[PDB]
Each structure stands twice: as C-alpha cells, then as structure tokens.
Design a protein around this ligand. Structure first.
Ligand SMILES: [Fe+3]
Lengths: 124, 522, 407, 522, 472
C-alpha cells in the first residue's frame, strides 16, 4: 500500500530493543520495501490495519516522534514506528523473527540505517 | 541476636549458634553439597605434584591472572599530564571498571570518561560517539587535553582514532588546536603496561613528531624521565628528590603523583599537577631520555631513539643497590653533575641496614610476582640481600625478559634454585608454592587467597604474603610507599625483615611449647 | 533506561557486570568463564561482597577468575576451539564443579563466536550444565540488560532442569529468596528471620546460591524477591509457568522488617502468623535498644542517596527509624555543588567511584553498594550494624578537620 | 639430628621427638615441677579480677617496669652534641648496660665511658677516678667536650661533680678551657627522661650561665628546639624539615640523629653531627625556645625562662593533627614566617588518610604505654581518630600529667571509658588487658610478653601488640620511623589501620569456617 | 703476622695512652705461667669504654637468672633490672608468670625515701607481695645493686626472717656492681650464695634413688639451647643428667647436684669454685667438657665415657658412629666456602679458648683472642690451645681493639653486641659470640651444623662487598 511500520519492543527496565522483522528479508512490515526506495491514511489507521492483517492481538502503540519518509518510484511513503508494550516478548508469528541490532550485520545498509534510526529515537 | 554494647559485624555475627545451625540446615537440605571427606580429598589432591603437572599442561584456560588490559595503563599514563582527561573510546563498563580498580588501589578520585559505545556503534562505528564524547568532555570538565585510548570493542570493529578525531575537529565539535593525543590499546595484546607504553608514545608523537626541525639535543640541559606504569606515589617522588639533590635538571614526563594525592580540604580537585604540554613539546631538546621501566617502554624507546635522536642508556630499573648505583652514575655522566655526599650517605645507610638484617634475611625463599621490571628489580634486590627467589612468576613477561632474568640469576650464587615463569597465572603459583614451599610470597592482594589455601593444608605449610606490587586492596595507604632508589630499597628491606620477624614471633608464641625462642631481642 | 551521554564521568556498568558480577557470580558451586580478554574478569574478581560458604578452589569458585584470556589469534580466528579446550581443562582441574557458565565479553559478540553451540556440545559430552550468556558489554545502556540476559539464561538453562522431577518433598511453608545477593550477609540475616517464622527457605540465589537451589526454586510455594529490578523477569516467568506467587520484601530497618514479616506471614496459615508475632516480640527489645542508643546522636541529619536500581527507594525506612531526614516502574514506586550547598546534606550514599569525590567535597559518605566493607545491613541483626556505621561515619571527627586553623 | 640440606635453629630443632622426650624426662625426673593442672589453674587465677585487685594493692614490689634510670637519658642527651663523649661517673656495669640497651634499640655503635668506680671509691669517693677518667677520655678518644652524668653509687656516696671537675682542671688533668658540663642524675629519682632533662640543663648552664651579659633575646632571629628524650630519628628529621619548609631559622639543641645513623662505608665514625658549642653558646640570643616534650623538660624550662629570659610557649608535643597545627601556628607567630602551602597540603593529605581509614579505626580499643609526652600525644591522636584509649599507663608519670591527660580525655566523647594509671608497671597492664580486654595494645617490645600471656588464655582473648615507643628490640629499623608532625601522624595511622587489617585477615583465614569475610577489598 | 710486628703494633697502639694508662695496658696485651706473659683480673682503666660488666650482671644475669622456678629480685633502683631483662638467651621450659620467672623483671624500684631510710621494710613487704601474687615460685633470690651495699642495708637478716616465716628458700646475693672489677666476682658471689643457701638443702635427705651413671651439668647456661644439645648427647651415651643448672635449671636440680657421681663443668670460670667445693665436701669428681665442634665433642664424649664402665664407652662409640655422617656432611658442605679464613675473638671468660675447635674443624685459623674478666688459669689454658705469633688481649679497650683489627685485618670477628656494630661499620664480618647473634644452639653435633651455617651466612654475605660506593 502506502504506509510502512517498523515493529519494535523495548523492555521498560532493561531497555532491550528487539525488532520483529520478516525472515524473508527486509525490516519493514507487512511487505518488503520497493527496491529503489531511498531516504528522502492515518498512522493509527495504518497500525490497526497492520494489526488486523497480521492477526496481532497485542498492545501496539505509535511512536509519533519517529516519522520517516522515503521515496519509491512515483510515491513518497511515510514509515512509522510501532512499539509493543508490556513486560514479556511475545512469541514471533510465522515468517517473523525477534532480532537485535547486532544481529542485523550482513543485512543491507538501508534496513540497518532504519533500525539505527529507530534505536536512536527510542534508547538514544 | 545483637547486643547494643558489643554489636558484631558479619564476622563474628555469622559464627553464632543460630546462624551456624541455619547455614547447616541450608547446606544439608538444599545445597546438595559434596561430602566433606570428598572435598578434603579433592583439596589434598590439588596440593600434590600430579595436580601440578595437570595444571601446568593448561593451554586454553587461565585461572586468577596477574595482569590487566591495555586501557587501564593508558588511563594511568593519561592521568600524569596537566589538566588531561583520560578518554576511552569504547564501552562505558570498561571505564567504570578502570575507575573502580584505581579507586580501590589509590583510595582517591579517578577521572576517566567514555563515549558509551553501544550496539549502534557496533554496527556503524563510533565516529558519532567520538564527536559527541569529545564535545561533551571539553564542555563539561574543561580539560586542557584529552588523551584517547580504546577498549576491546573499538579495536575489534576497527575504529580509526586518527580519522575520527580529525573529523571531530573539522566539523567544529572541538577546536582545531585543542590537543587530543590518541593511542590504539588493544586489550587482547600485551597487558596494562603495554597500554601505558602505547599512550605515552601516542602523546609524545602528537606533541613532537611534526616539530622536530627546530629541536637540538641538549638545548635545555635537562634529562627526560619516563617512569612507566608506576602505582607507588613514593616512586615518583624519590626520583625527583634524588635528581634535585644531584642538581640535575629533569622533566618527569607523565607525573601523576599530584592528582593521586590530592589533599582533603573541603574542595574536590579534578586536576592537580602533572606534566605540562610545554614540557612535552620541549622534550626533544633534552640531553637524553632515561626510561625507568625499559622492559615495557619499548615503543617509547623506539620513538625516542628514532625521532628525538636520543641515545637512551641501557639502564635497568633503579631498584635495589647495584641498579640504583648504575642509574645514579649514568645520570651523573649524562648531566655532568657529580653525585652529592647526601646520596653517598643514603647508600651507606642502606648498606648498614643490609648488614644489620643479613642474619635474618639470608637463605629465605621467596615466590614473587608482578610486572616485568618490578619483578626483575625485586629479584636483583633479593639476590643482593642473600635471599633465594624460588618462584619468579610474570604473567605479562616475554622470552627476552625471561632470558635477562635468567642471566641475572646465573650471576648470583643464590639463584641456583630459581625458576622464571612467563605466561603463568596465580593458579600455577599456588601449585608451585604447594609442591616447592617457599618461606614467603611477594605480590599484590590477589595472593591473599593463596595464603588462605596453604593454611588450609596446615599451619606448617602456610606461606605468608608480603604486599609489594599492584593492586593492593586489603591494606590502606601502601600506595604511598617507595620501591625505587635507596629509600625504596630500605623500605623493602624493612618490610621483608619485619615480616620474617612477625612470622617467627607468631610461630614461637606458644606458652611452654615454643616460647623458649620468644626472644625479646631479635 | 536510556543511553548515557558520551564523554561524561558516568559510573554505569556493562551487561557483563550485571550478568557475571551480579546474577551469575555469586553462584558458588558453578564455574564462570569470562570469555574474552583478560581485563573484564580481573577488574570484576572478588569485587562484590556476595558472601558464601564453601571451600574456594574445590567446591566453591566465587572469588576466582576463570577467563579465556583472548589474544590476537583468538580474535582473528575466533575462540570456539579455545572455549572447548578451556571447558575440558576446567573439568580436568576442578572436578567438583556443579556447572559452567560462559559469560561473554565485548569481542565475543563482534567476532561472530557461537558459544551456544560449543556449550550444547560440551554439555552433551560431559553431562554437565553449561550456560552460555551473551552479556557483551556494548549491549544495552547499563547493567539492567545484564540482569535481563542473565535471567533469560537462568530460565532457559537452569530453571527447568527438574520440571519432570517429582522426588522433592514439598511443604506448605516453602519460600524461595530471589534477588538477594548476600552483600555482607544480608541474605543470611533475612533467612534467619524467615526460618524463625516457621518457613522453609528451599532456594536462596544468587547470594550464597547453588545450582541445586535454582533448580529447586520452581518447587516452592512463595517467591520472596529482594531486588525487583534484576529478578522481575524470572519472578514473572515463574508465576506464569509454575503458578508460584511472588512478593517483594523489605528487611531494611525495624519498621520495614516488621511490616514485611507480617505481610509474608499473611500469605500462610495462622501458625506462621503466630510465629511471626513471636519473632517480632523476641526481636523488639534489641532494635529498641539500638534506636535508644543511636537515634539521639543521629536525629535531624539529612540524607541523599544515589544507587543503582533498588536501594535508592527502599533504604528510607531505616533512615527514618534512626530519626534521620531523607531529601520507569522504579520511579513510580530530587529524583535525578550549588544545590548541595543550598540543602547542606549531612550524608550521601552512593558507590565507590563517587565515594572519594564526595569525600573530597567534605560530605560524609556511605558506600551503598558494598556496605563500605561492613554489614549485614538488612534484618534486625543488620539494623544494629547499620546504626553503628551511621554513627561512625556521620559523627567522625575527621569531617570537622577539613579546614586548616590558619586559613 | 640435623639434615645438612635443611638445618634447623633452636626453633624448631627442639620440637623434634628426641628433644621432646629428653625434656619430658628432665621435667618428670628432677625438676619437681608442679602438676600441669595446678599450673593451668594458677594461670587462670592470674587472669581474673580478684588477682587484679591483689595486683593493684602492690606497694613495694615492681614487676616488669616501663621505665629506666636517669643516666641512660643523660647519655642520650650527651650523644646529641658535636664530638661529645658521654661520661658516667660511677661503676662500669651501668655504662655497659646503657650501651647494650642503645645498641639493641638503634642497632648502631654507642659511645659512652665510665671511670669504673670500685670498692675503693666507696670509702674515699671518686676524685682520683674522675681525674684519671677525664684524662684518659681526652687523650684516647679526643672529644671536643665531655658530658658527665652519675650512677646510683656516686649519688649515694655523695660525689661532688663540680668540685671533682674543678680539681681535675686545676691539678693538670684536662685543659682549663676544655668543656666539661656535668649533671647529677640520681637513678632513684624519676626516670631516663629526668636524666635527659638534667643533662640538658647542665650543658645549657655550663655554656650560658656566666655569659648572659652580652645576650639579647631575638638577636640571631632563630628559634631553639629542645626535643627531649627522643629515640626516633624521623622525629628529629621531621622537625628540621618542617622548620626549613617555613623558612624559620632554628637551632636544634641536642641533635643525635647524625651519630645514630652513621653510614656503613668501611669507616667507623665515633662522632657525627650534633649540636655545636657555638649553637649552645648563642642559644640565649634566640627569639624563643620551644620544648618538644614539655612534661619531662621542666628543669630545662625553668632554666630557660629564668636565665635566658625566654617566654617559652605552653605547647603540647607536636603529635597528631591539632597539636601539630598548634605547634606550627606558634612557630609562625614567634618567627613571623607564614605557614607555607606545602605544610597545608601535608595536613590535607593527613586528613584525607584519616577519612579513608576512619571506618576501620573508629571504636577500636587500645591500651597504650610509654613516656608521658609520647603517651599523651598518642592519646590525643587516638581521640582524633575516634579510637578509645581504654587503658593509659605511664610508669614515670606524675599527678599533674595525669590531670592533664584526664582533661584531654574529658574533652572528647571517646575518652569516656579511659583510665590513666601512673606508677603502675606492665604486670598491672597485663591484669588490665586480661580483665578489661582492649582490641590492641601500643607500646615497646616488652609488651610482646603480655600478648603471649593473652594467647595462652585463648585466641579470642589475645591482645595484639603494636610496637610504637622505646625500646623496640624484636623488630629491625623501626627507630627510623616518625611520630611527630603530620608525617609521623600518617605513619602512626598507617601502622594502626594496617595492624587492624592484618588481625582481621588472620581471624578470617579459616577455610569454610570464617573465610566468608576474607574480603579482597578492605 | 710476624711476632716483631705484633710487638710493634702493641707499642704503637699504646703510644697514645697516658703514662699510667699505657703502663697498665702494656701488661694486658701479649703475644702468644700467665704472669710471665699476661696480667689478668685487674682494675680497668677509667674512661676507656670498657666492655666489662658488673658483679650484678655476673650474678643475677648469669648464674641466678637462668633458674626458672625461682623469683629473682633486683634489689635497688629500676635501671639495673630493666637493662638485664631477657638480655641473655638462657632458654628454659615453663609457663612464664606462673611457674617460671626468667624473662620477667622483679625489682624493688628504690626511690629517694628508700635510699634515705633504707629498704629492709620495703624488702619484707616485697617478699610478702611476691608470695601473694606468685604462689608457685619455689624460691626467692635477692640480688643486691650498687645502693644496697652503700646505704648499710642488711638483706641477710630480712632473708632469714622471711624464709623462716614462709618456709621458703630466700637467697641474699650481695652482688653490688661496684664490688670487684668485672663479672668474675659476681660469679664468685653467686657461687658462694648457691653453696651457702641452696646446695646443702638435701645433705640430710636420702630419698633420691641414685644410679652409677649420675652426672650434673654445671656452668652451662643454655644460650640458645646449648645445654639441651649437650644433654641429648650425654643421655644417648647412657648417662643420667640429674642436675642441669643454671641454664633451664631448677632449684630442685641444684639441691640434687650433690647426689650425682660426676660433675661435667662447661664454664670453668663461673662455676669452678662450686665444683671444687663439691669435690672437697661431697667427694664428687669434676671434669671439663667441650662440646663445641665435632672433634672437641667426640674427644669430650670419649673422655666422659672413660670415667664409667664398658657399657657407657660402647654407647659412646655408638653415639659417635651415629652422629658421624651428619657432621661429616656439614663439614663437606661448608668447609669449602670457609677454608682459609682468619678469625679474631674478644669474648668473656670461657668461650675465647673453647671456640677454637669448631673454627679449625671448618678450616678457619684463629689469629687473635682475648678475655674481658679471665684469670691467670684461663690464659694458661688458652696459650696451649692457640697458635704461635698471635695477639692476646685482656680487658681490651675500644681504641686498642679497633686499632688491632685495623692492623691485622681479619676475615671474621667474634665479640659482643657493643663492638658488633663498630666492626660492622669498619667492614669486617661480625658474629655475636655471646648470644649467638640470636641463633643457636652452637654446642654438640646438632649445634655444629647451625654454627657452620651461620659462619657461611655472615662471612660470605654479599653485604660486605658493597661497602665502597662505585663512584669513589
Ligand atoms: Fe646499623
């Protein structure tokens, strides 16, 4: 569609930033980013649509400060940040994994930069 | 239970019957502890020679090392310069551990900062971390200089200190003229003394490499003194006192004796004394450079001989009698100043103390450990005292140092039963003192556990510890002692002979059993 | 729980410090390998005063430093073969160890070392519990991440070792002390009061803790958590999985100790409550005498504290019991020279690194991390020592001699 | 039996089975020893309070005194002058004992002569003995001045030193202008400190009494320092160092720190340093005279205030922090020289060491003994450290000194449980430390026999000894320590805190019993 | 050293003395009947830094002090008892303060009042307090100091009265320091006190079971355990050492001494009078034994065994055979490092001539000796046991002895503590021949190993090779 969501979970005590990302590549939910995308609907509507399509029955909140906007051929696509509240990491759904930032080594520069910006927004 | 008139701390509060019964119930009900006979059998096995061969076959396991990492020595070197902040580019836990270590040893505030390198810097490097850390450090603590070292993570990910600092200066985070010397200090190479060497070489490079076209050797008629990794406040002062008595102009580079001995007058001083930047910039103009601890100041020696064009004398550490004499003669030859009568009288008094205490010091067996230069100086002094060093252990020593110490031992009749161990930790020394029992050990506080183990075998097998080295944690104000020069030699001799005398007094304090030898005059 | 500003003299530890030094280190019967270079284990060797009972070097290894001592070749080519050889040598030289825990240092997670596979292989070969902990120092912003990672390792490797075992004789008065690290014997001073109440302390970890006690923890009826910050994860996991209720207890000062004892006894039958009242009556005269002796010389003095995660907010009760004034979930239960001058605090309580700074500034100081080489400070027996140390530090003449008489 | 590889001295050779059997046969066959149960019962009785009441009822018996005779102090005072020979008119055994005592304490050659008065002198006096002794002493050892004291024999028989010396000079045995000061030192009056006072007063009288017409107070702009009976070389050196730091001109009268620390260089020096005769002759020209130990320099104070017209300040011994401060301010006021920043930094460092070790020193209970000024200075320092001097004993103290020490104790919260004993010996102190056990006892080597006694009751009852005082015989080179000034305060503080730490380490070295408190960091 | 050179040295060292001092000292320095060569046991020259002691030192500190079960009172001021407290290493076995009182100082602490009005009432009160506070003492000895004999104090009457009242043996020893010229008169006075008060306490008692192998060790003061090392060898020979005083000695052993069959006298100088008295009265033969060095020990053991039946001689041969390998190994190890070294000694009454045995056993040569308080008989015994063209000094002064050593320049010196530091400064290795330099024992086969080890430790110590600054 037109929106992208980076799904994260930060522990209130230990501040462990885990990222729920697809196992097939990419860093964004629900689908991967267009190949040519470079760094350049309501956000709550995007969050609820992602929750409905991915069968996420958890408490997901919108980090309104983290707004990014990339350009894909013929479209300016905002991407937002969705944080998972609570105290326990939920079991990852099918096709998704709960990676850490140091576990992003070997992934392309674009998604590593996206995760770095998320980490700076939340912990830094 | 507690009595308000005789309140007891953990010892001996936990020796009470109720606490003993509770601990026994805990052990017998849920700890699933091995039987006490089994524990005794295993301990007896660990004190045998078969366990010694099994322990000395170790090649991948290190138990109770006697060394630290390079950035600790780098921080110690950085602390010796005027208004200089040690800045360790890397994780903050390393800096916290360095500060805790130096606080426990010196019992003084220790200044050190980090850029808090985190997973983000693990993926992308610490360039932003370096910029922000340099800016915040300069804006907050107002240092005249920031001396940069590295932790293991920065060296592993490959952070270029030179490029990072240059980029920080170019983008306006710090002024272009602000002195920011740097040194790469990989914690997996060498030990803390190597870190001290790297930091000193980096600072000397930063201050002298690009301004050697107007430097003439002997212009200021002074002698540069590089003390190396030194944790005795008296060692910095004895060198200065002896050089001032000789009338010799000197420049003690990296002198931290002032910031580590700040007076308590209701005011906190982050910076106090230290080597000035002008002394470093004028260092190549000196007559010569004398390295107090040459066996870990190798990169410094190479830089001084190659760039400063100084004929660095081949001097051992000024520890003991002969080596202090050689150091004084070399200083006199370089400076042209005759050795004064005060130093001759001090040497005579030291020899007098040696003659007084030789009857008790002769023939004693010592197992000593520490840094290479300190260990070799202590071995030389023990040989001069008639003592027999039997277990010379140096975890951070090399083969050339071992060969030099073996040559020193072979030159004395008292080094016949001496073995030099390099790359061996304190668990090796435990087996060494269990199988070949010496009279005493000489080392840092980490040996206090070995004395606990030997006493477990029996009082006759106990090997008392003498705390000469780094770090000393279980005693107060021992960092103010001296080990260099005649004064340090007298202090060491007094400590050794008095420790022998306390051991003899304790062994002969049994009434009607061993008190016949409890002599008043000893 | 955010990043620390670069270039500042913060005292925050690493994940390795929070995992090896705090959670795993006090376990006595297990051997903990500081996998990586030599500095981390050496600076953390016997640093924290987590007291224990055992023969060091034979069956207890708390104050010992086991390390891989990484060199350049171990960084270039990895340290997995070295880890396997080290595990073999540990088994050869220390046969009475009941487990091995490999605490990772910074280079381990950066050079791409699979310590989990080595741990699994060597544990299968030696029939020993080897726990790989990825406590690399760069991970996280403080020791809290170390606590979380160590708790995850406990849950995933040690906690479920007796899930299918039902040979343990359980009683309705089974409690487990979690988060008490026995700093100066605090855990013992709490366990004596708990057992005098009729309760059976099946597990007490990590302070004076053993692997058997950790394995037996899921078999208790109540979990008494001292440090919530470091064991909240494990307490919640045990509550969700084994259905064991957990509650927080505070034994600092007589009022807090009495309230916590009554609250704990309220979770059991009337016999435990009667025994708790009897214990309170027994210990009343002792702390009453302590207050009568030390409150007069401590009344009115003002306090500031700044400690890691738990002690900043739970030490107030003992201070008020002595007549002394004190001036995200942790904050829910000044909240960080000129300010110090305006309020003129009589005492500041923080760690060793700030201890000497505040000594130089002239304010009397108390090490709130290691009890200033004293203790215990918790329980009725520890309240006397705490009051004595308060009087010793606050009223020492050394603080009145800072100014030279000629200035 | 002996093994040539490991030769055993008396300990533990006499612990072998054959020697034990031989000694057991000797005891059980011919010694007629009391049964061991009887010995144990009597020893237990001696450690009770009833035995303490019996012991403190003593009126005529002295057991283990803590004092010496006047001529010893007279000899020590005489040794502090330039090329001066101590000459004790009386029996030679007294001189032999003085020389042996000082040789065992200082481990140095001590020069002292006697006229060897015998039974013949018991009926006719020692006039011929004095003449011959003076002539032989001047001809043989060539001293610049002979300082004459007396033994008990010469005082009992009533030998007039003035008349004897006048006749010796008149009859042609020594030159009429040769300096021969004399002092009557009755060994049955006072103690060695009284002898020091008498000898110093005699020397000052001899050199200044008849030449006071041309003396103006404050002409030479210097301050006279009278150290009294001092047996620490560091005490002599610290006063000179502190006065030189302030830039204050001083004259240290009776300075023996040079002849008691002569170097070993293949040459024996009978005389070294000391107060010159010109310094003593120019002493009345000083601004003021400061007595370092005023509580045994009362005769010297009377002479200085009466003859020299010097307003001697009422200063305590410069021991500890407050009294060192008072001494420094008084010296600054007299000389007009402001206290330098180096001394302020030294005071701040002492305060820092006080704050660093206050957690280990506060509340500790000490039983101390020694000379009056030293004891009161130690008590003041202990009160400044938060320690409790429960048992203060001074055999040679008087009622006024006891009142002063009681006034000092009542001014501090830590003197509540403190009692001052004057005229009591070390057996009284043994009873005190058995019935009211302190944590440590501070004193000379003679206390090593009390500690053993306590150890015979049990390890829980043992009172360790800290060797600070005179004489120290069982330790080497402790006479070079310092007890005066800030430096002496730091040395004493370090000794006390480290002794406490060794005791704690020893008490917690039991494996699996008390090693839970065997903390690496203390 | 040529003899003419020794005479020239003596003349040169005496050149600086006054005429009276020179003429007196010329009779006390000789080159190896005593009267023809050396003059001994005479007055010491005033003001010449004498090493001699007093009669109190030779009586209380030497003969009476080592007795453990007795309490010895230093009657007089405090100094004499304070300086002699635990000065001598006369080892003993006992509970100090309960049944043994060797290292403890008992004194009356005389003041001006006691000097003016006497100290007899004070002495009686002191004896009462001693009996009250130390009930397990087996006897009291009152050692007089210098003031006692000058103020007209009658301690004999007090001793007799209090001993009769308390049924205790109180021995008054008038050992005033001014009496005599040295400690030899102290030895004589102490021996007379032993004979007159303690020795005859069991003359009418016949309840001791005696054996034909009864010997008594007299004059061995257990300096570092010498007496024990001699007694072990004596008892391994089959002899029963009934009495061993003063070292580790008891009053019961002193009383039992007249019941022995032989008196082995170690120190002839201090305990020759008592040995002669016992031989004349009780008919007990006495012989001198020397256990210093292996050769002397073997010769003395054979001579002692020759006084008994064949079984004792066979046991002596067995003991010598048993101890042969140990001292042979000691010699083999230490003689190479001690061969050819020259020694000089200045000791008190007995040791200067006794110690020459083990030095030769180790390959050393003695080139000079002397005494503090010896008599003519001691020098008569010494000249036979020393080499030719050597220097003998009687009551040598400080200056004389330093010049002597500066001229001979030996390799080792054995003397007291008062010259130890002087010779340490002059650069000559020194061994305390009085207290064994806080080592020992030195007597017997076990003591020979310690003696050789100490000789090698001191003589070959590196500290003597660092006395010259390398820039001078
Ligand atoms: Fe000396």
């Amino acid at each position: 569609m037109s929106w992208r969501i980076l799904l994260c979970h930060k522990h209130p005590v230990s501040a462990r930033l885990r990222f729920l990302i697809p196992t097939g590549g990419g860093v964004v939910l629900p689908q991967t980013l267009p190949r040519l995308a470079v760094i350049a609907c309501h956000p709550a509507s995007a969050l609820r649509a992602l929750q409905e399509t991915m069968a996420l029955g958890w408490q997901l909140e919108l980090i309104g400060e983290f707004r990014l906007n990339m350009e894909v051929p013929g479209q300016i696509m905002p991407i937002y940040l969705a944080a998972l509240a609570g105290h326990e990491l939920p079991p990852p759904p099918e096709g998704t994994r709960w990676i850490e930032l140091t576990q992003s080594i070997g992934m392309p520069w674009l998604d590593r930069e996206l995760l770095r910006r998320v980490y700076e927004e939340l912990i830094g | 239970s507690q009595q308000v008139d005789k309140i007891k701390a953990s010892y001996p509060l936990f020796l009470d019957q109720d606490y003993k019964d509770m601990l026994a119930k805990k052990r017998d009900g849920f700890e699933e502890k091995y039987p006490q006979d089994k524990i005794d059998e295993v301990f007896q096995w660990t004190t045998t020679k078969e366990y010694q061969e099994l322990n000395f076959q170790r090649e991948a396991l290190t138990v109770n090392p006697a060394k630290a990492c390079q950035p600790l020595g780098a921080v110690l070197c950085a602390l010796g310069f005027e208004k200089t902040m040690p800045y360790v580019h890397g994780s903050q836990g390393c800096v916290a551990y360095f500060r805790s270590y130096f606080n426990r040893h010196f019992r003084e505030p220790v200044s050190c900062v980090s850029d808090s390198m985190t997973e983000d810097a693990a993926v992308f490097g610490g360039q932003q971390n370096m910029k922000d850390g340099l800016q915040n450090c300069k804006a907050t603590y107002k240092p005249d200089m920031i001396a940069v070292s590295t932790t293991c993570m920065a060296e592993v990910i490959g952070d270029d200190l030179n490029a990072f600092i240059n980029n920080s200066k170019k983008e306006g985070f710090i002024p272009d003229e602000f002195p920011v010397p740097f040194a790469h200090t990989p914690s997996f190479v060498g030990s803390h003394v190597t870190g001290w060497d790297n930091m000193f070489e980096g600072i000397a490079r930063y201050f002298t490499l690009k301004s050697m076209d107007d430097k003439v050797v002997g212009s200021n008629k002074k002698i540069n003194i590089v003390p190396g990794f030194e944790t005795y406040l008296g060692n910095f002062r004895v060198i200065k006192r002896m050089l001032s008595e000789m009338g010799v102009g000197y420049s003690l580079l990296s002198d931290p004796e002032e910031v580590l001995d700040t007076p308590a007058d209701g005011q906190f001083r982050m910076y106090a004394g230290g080597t000035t930047q002008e002394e470093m910039k004028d260092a190549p103009n000196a007559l010569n450079t004398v390295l107090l601890q040459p066996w870990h100041l190798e990169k410094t020696k190479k830089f001084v001989e190659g760039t400063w064009k100084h004929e660095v004398p081949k001097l051992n550490i000024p520890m003991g009698l002969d080596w202090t004499d050689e150091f004084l003669m070399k200083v006199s030859e370089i400076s042209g100043q005759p050795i004064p009568a005060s130093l001759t009288k001090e040497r005579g008094r030291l020899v007098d103390m040696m003659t007084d205490s030789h009857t008790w010091l002769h023939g004693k067996r010592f197992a000593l450990w520490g840094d290479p230069d300190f260990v070799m100086g202590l071995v030389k002094f023990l040989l001069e005292l008639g003592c027999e060093p039997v277990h010379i252990l140096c975890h951070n020593g090399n083969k050339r140092w071992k060969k030099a110490v073996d040559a020193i031992l072979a030159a004395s009749p008292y080094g016949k039963n001496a073995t030099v161990y390099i790359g061996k930790d304190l668990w090796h020394l435990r087996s060494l003192v269990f199988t070949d029992k010496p009279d005493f050990m000489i080392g840092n506080s980490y040996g206090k556990f070995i004395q606990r183990d030997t006493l477990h075998k029996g009082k006759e097998f106990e090997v008392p510890l003498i705390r000469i080295g780094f770090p000393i944690f279980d005693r107060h104000h021992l960092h103010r002692s001296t080990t260099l020069g005649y004064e340090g030699a007298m202090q060491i001799l007094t400590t050794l002979v008095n420790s022998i005398l306390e051991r003899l007094d304790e062994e002969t304090r049994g009434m009607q059993a061993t008190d016949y030898n409890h002599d008043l005059v000893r | 729980n955010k990043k620390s500003q670069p270039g500042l003299m913060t005292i925050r530890g690493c994940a390795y410090a929070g995992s090896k030094g705090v959670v795993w280190g006090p376990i006595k019967d297990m051997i903990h390998i500081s996998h990586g270079p030599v500095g981390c284990g050496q600076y953390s060797r016997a640093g924290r005063r987590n007291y224990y009972i055992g023969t060091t070097g034979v069956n207890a290894f708390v104050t010992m430093n086991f390390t891989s001592d990484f060199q350049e070749k171990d960084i270039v080519f990895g340290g997995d073969k070295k880890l396997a050889k080290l595990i073999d040598e540990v088994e050869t030289l220390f046969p009475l160890n009941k487990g091995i825990s490999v605490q990772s240092e910074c280079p381990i997670g950066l050079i791409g070392d699979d310590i989990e596979s080595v741990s699994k292989v060597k544990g299968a070969e030696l029939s020993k519990t080897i726990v790989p902990v990825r406590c690399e120092g760069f991970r996280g912003v403080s020791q809290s991440l170390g606590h979380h990672i160590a708790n995850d390792a406990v849950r995933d490797w040690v906690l479920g070792k007796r899930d299918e075992d039902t040979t343990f004789a359980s009683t309705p008065y089974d409690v487990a002390i979690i988060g008490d690290y026995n700093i100066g014997g605090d855990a013992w001073s709490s366990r004596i009061l708990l057992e005098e109440m009729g309760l059976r302390c099946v597990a007490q970890w990590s302070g004076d803790g053993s692997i058997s006690e950790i394995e037996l923890t899921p078999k208790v009826k109540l979990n008494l958590v001292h440090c919530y910050r470091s064991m909240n994860y494990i307490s919640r996991h045990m509550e969700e999985k084994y259905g064991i209720p957990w509650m927080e207890y505070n034994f600092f000062g007589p009022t807090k100790t009495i309230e916590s004892l009554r609250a704990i006894a309220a979770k059991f039958d009337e016999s435990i409550q009667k025994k708790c009242e009897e214990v309170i009556a027994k210990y009343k005269p002792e702390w009453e005498a302590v207050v009568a002796k030390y409150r007069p010389r401590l009344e009115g003095k003002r306090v500031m504290l700044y400690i890691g995660g738990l002690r900043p907010r739970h030490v107030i009760g003992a201070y008020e019991d002595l007549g002394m004034e004190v001036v995200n979930d942790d904050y829910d239960r000044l909240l960080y020279e000129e300010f110090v001058k305006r309020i003129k605090p009589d005492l500041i309580g923080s760690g060793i690194k700030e201890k000497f700074i505040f000594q130089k500034m002239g304010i009397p100081f108390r090490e709130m991390h290691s009890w200033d080489y004293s203790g215990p400070y918790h329980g009725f027996d520890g309240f006397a020592i705490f009051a004595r140390d308060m009087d010793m530090t606050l009223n020492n003449p050394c603080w009145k001699k800072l100014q030279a008489p000629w200035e």
